[PDB]
Symmetry: C2
Subunit: 618 residues, 2 copies
């Protein structure tokens, strides 16, 4: 069968891919001094018209993410120069090895790296946050990922599928004329539609290139396979440009723009949203009009799932410690309810679980929404996959998720119709830009500062608020809350500078077409055109500070003083081996023990309320 042939042709070793990186630079050199959003449009166009393309063994859905797959795409405008600085280590290192062709290793080191030096997002942000960049790089307090770009959004496919890219091209053209009729006082809006036009043309032409390759392969091929490649030629002539009418046409639509998006936006978390909800009209029509059968539909979805394994991240040696496990995470969201609370599981939901269960590959990140009204069969079928060790599902509980969104002031209907992207991030589907992994914060470092008067306990870094030496438990709590605050403020300042930096040196016009309100308002996504705009920042170490508080509580209670406990910590419990055993014996978060897990809860609430009050640039 077909899946078996497809599974084996993405198990070969991964490479460092360079063709996107090169052609991007090539266009950017041709375009210097032009309006940056037009430069980004023209660059994306140039890569889509000139990247080597290939249809693979027995494929029904085409669109390689990079030429000759498993690989890493390089984004030197973001954080791709990190990896050039370590080219020697890439084929022989223990995790996420990438073969590097030494002929294009020379092209990176003396053609790419000297050009993009000081043309990056980080180059914009540096003079504006030099004190933050310094403490970012110590690796100890937070990481800020918007250096690398934004991404992290489930793409609005139903917006796209109801229009098609020939609509955008023509609408951009009507809007360019009307702007000219009023004398172009709205220059920004004008640049936008100019970019949109260009970027639509690119995507139309990109589908057309795969149509031509399909035709070229079919005058050289036999029987059923020749029938398939002729269909692929016919489909890719029509869609990404027209509204699709069949299920195969829909799935080929989404994957073309999905692969396209990966040439403009960096590798993290560009997701497909509630794919079971929006492919279902095409599916239901095709079955029972005889157009397709259940096994063909399966193979179509299988092909899509399998193709998202073509990317593997361009992480250097340090980024491999903080993001280990080849994290890219094109997510997919199945199941859940409608905007009324009714169960929205359909036959395509089940199908998608099955292909997930069979494939057991690292990618797509499949996210399953369940709630109190999910069908019992579906929960059984989820439990069967998980218990048989599939290890590739995540479960999202609607009740808690829509409550979270309603407090973030999301509309009823937009919260009910939520999507997921990345790992665990939630968002209104299709009309939001949430920068869902914009930072990660070491809240343990807050506690460390909180008992050492804003100094790192073992490194001498004065990065914390200037609190005092702590005495009792109660005034370590105040000192803790103040320190969390201080650290959050550091990342909100940092991420905002970076978000302005993205808006200025890396607007992303294709992605803008895919995120609602952007195209209609004529403002790019990185400038805030999405209906909802958020910046997701993450707490790490919430149980470590929670548990340290319980352990401080009892240790003071019976016997010891505060000065002991900090000195124990500074000295790594060497010379403090009695107390250390009492600390270790203390109640821990994870055991249903209120006296322990109340502290962790409180730490999270402090964090949450310190974050949710700040506004972002967008």
């Amino acid at each position: 069968d077909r899946i078996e042939k497809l599974i084996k042709k993405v198990s070969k070793p991964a490479r460092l891919s360079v063709e996107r990186c090169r052609l991007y630079t090539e266009s950017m050199k041709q375009t210097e001094g032009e309006p940056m959003i037009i430069r980004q449009a023209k660059a994306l166009k140039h890569v889509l018209e000139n990247i080597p393309i290939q249809i693979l063994d027995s494929e029904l859905i085409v669109g390689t993410m990079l030429p000759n797959p498993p690989g890493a795409i390089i984004f030197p405008e973001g954080v791709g120069l990190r990896i050039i600085n370590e080219l020697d280590s890439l084929p022989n290192r223990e995790t996420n090895r990438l073969m590097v062709d030494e002929e294009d290793a020379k092209v990176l080191r003396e053609e790419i790296a000297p050009y993009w030096q000081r043309k990056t997002i980080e180059a914009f942000a540096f003079p504006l946050m030099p004190d933050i960049m310094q403490i970012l790089y110590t690796g100890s307090v937070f990481v800020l990922t918007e250096i690398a770009g934004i991404s992290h959004v489930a793409v609005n496919y139903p917006y796209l599928l109801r229009r098609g890219f020939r609509w955008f091209l023509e609408e951009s053209e009507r809007r360019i004329r009307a702007l000219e009729e009023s004398g172009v006082y709205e220059g920004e809006k004008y640049s936008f539609y100019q970019a949109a036009k260009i970027v639509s043309e690119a995507v139309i032409n990109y589908g057309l290139r795969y149509s031509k390759l399909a035709e070229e392969l079919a005058e050289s091929e036999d029987g059923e396979r020749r029938e398939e490649l002729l269909k692929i030629a016919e489909i890719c002539r029509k869609v990404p440009a027209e509204k699709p009418e069949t299920f195969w046409e829909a799935v080929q639509f989404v994957w073309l723009v999905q692969s396209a998006l990966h040439q403009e936006n960096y590798e993290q978390a560009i997701s497909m949203g509630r794919i079971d909800q929006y492919l279902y009209p095409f599916f239901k029509k095709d079955i029972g009009e005889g157009r397709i059968n259940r096994e063909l539909a399966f193979d179509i979805l299988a092909n899509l799932w399998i193709k998202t394994n073509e990317i593997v991240p361009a992480f250097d040696s340090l980024l491999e410690q903080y993001f280990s496990g080849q994290a890219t995470n094109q997510a997919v969201t199945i199941g859940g309810c409608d905007i009324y609370g009714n169960d929205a599981t359909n036959e395509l939901t089940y199908l998608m679980l099955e292909v997930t269960d069979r494939l057991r590959l690292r990618q797509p990140n499949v996210h399953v929404r369940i709630n109190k009204g999910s069908p019992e069969s579906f929960l059984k079928r989820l439990a069967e996959a998980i218990s048989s060790g599939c290890n590739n599902l995540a479960l999202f509980f609607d009740d808690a998720a829509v409550k979270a969104l309603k407090n973030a002031e999301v509309d009823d209907r937009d919260a009910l119709n939520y999507t997921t992207d990345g790992c665990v991030e939630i968002a209104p589907f299709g009309n939001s830009f949430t920068s869902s992994d914009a930072a990660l914060i070491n809240v343990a470092k807050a506690l460390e500062y909180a008992l050492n008067e804003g100094v790192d306990l073992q490194f001498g870094y004065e990065f914390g608020a200037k609190t005092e030496k702590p005495k009792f438990l109660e005034d370590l709590l105040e000192k803790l809350r103040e320190q969390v605050s201080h650290i959050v403020k550091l990342v909100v300042r940092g991420s905002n500078v970076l978000s302005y930096a993205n808006a200025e040196v890396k607007p992303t016009p294709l992605l803008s077409l895919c995120v609602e309100d952007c195209f209609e308002k004529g403002v790019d996504v990185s400038r805030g055109g999405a209906r909802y705009n958020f910046t997701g920042i993450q707490a790490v170490g919430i149980a470590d500070v929670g548990d340290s508080l319980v352990a401080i509580e009892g240790a003071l209670n019976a016997g010891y003083s505060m000065d002991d406990i900090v000195e124990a910590c500074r000295k790594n419990f060497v010379g403090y081996e009695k107390l250390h055993k009492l600390l270790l014996q203390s109640p821990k978060y994870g055991n249903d023990d209120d006296a322990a897990d109340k502290y962790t809860k409180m730490v999270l609430e402090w964090y949450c309320e310190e974050v949710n009050r700040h506004r972002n640039f967008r």
Copy 2:
């Protein structure tokens, strides 16, 4: 008398000046990839701290517009590359002749002109109006001067004279802090005050450079002229940074920022406004407090007129 000595020392032939053009490029190379408004601030600062300066024959108001006067300032970010393309014709042409030092003619042709090629205002606008650029260049229907930059504004001197540039520096600093306290969601506003800070510092330091030259010339000078240069040292230490209190202090204020503005903005129409209205408080106070007399006041204004 003093006017006669001043009149004759701006009647010499004009040159193509290059020092602003060079130091601008020098800073812009150090600053690539930074926020453009900060780059412009840092460039202006670099030229004001490093341009050759000179006090001239019998001057009371100092601040040469370019080193070694009558000359042209080059703005390659605007329309200064037009003139590099015709360097040969400049010393020998019938109107507006400019001597070009052939050592810095080499610096324009292969250091300035290849850098600013496609970093200009026109390079931004071209892909967005290619049909207009085509009919602009036929010379027949219109000319559009904003290729060269904007300028054309009478500068608000009374706004400036009521604050002084140390006010701006400090206020920018209060405003930078308050923006940081609210997490810098207003990035643009933040870039602005960052630029303002830098640009205020530049102007304060620029007055200070002329104060130091005045002091340096006066330990080498005799009698009345030594009295004058010591006054100029005292005035340029105080103003462009503080609010002026005397008429001489006011007129030296306006001319320093006036010469400064000409290093940032292109040569057209940077004006001084209702100068008779806003210099009159300092004038009325000084006459009848005996501070100055009518003939000194005349010479002060004469110096300003002559410097433009």
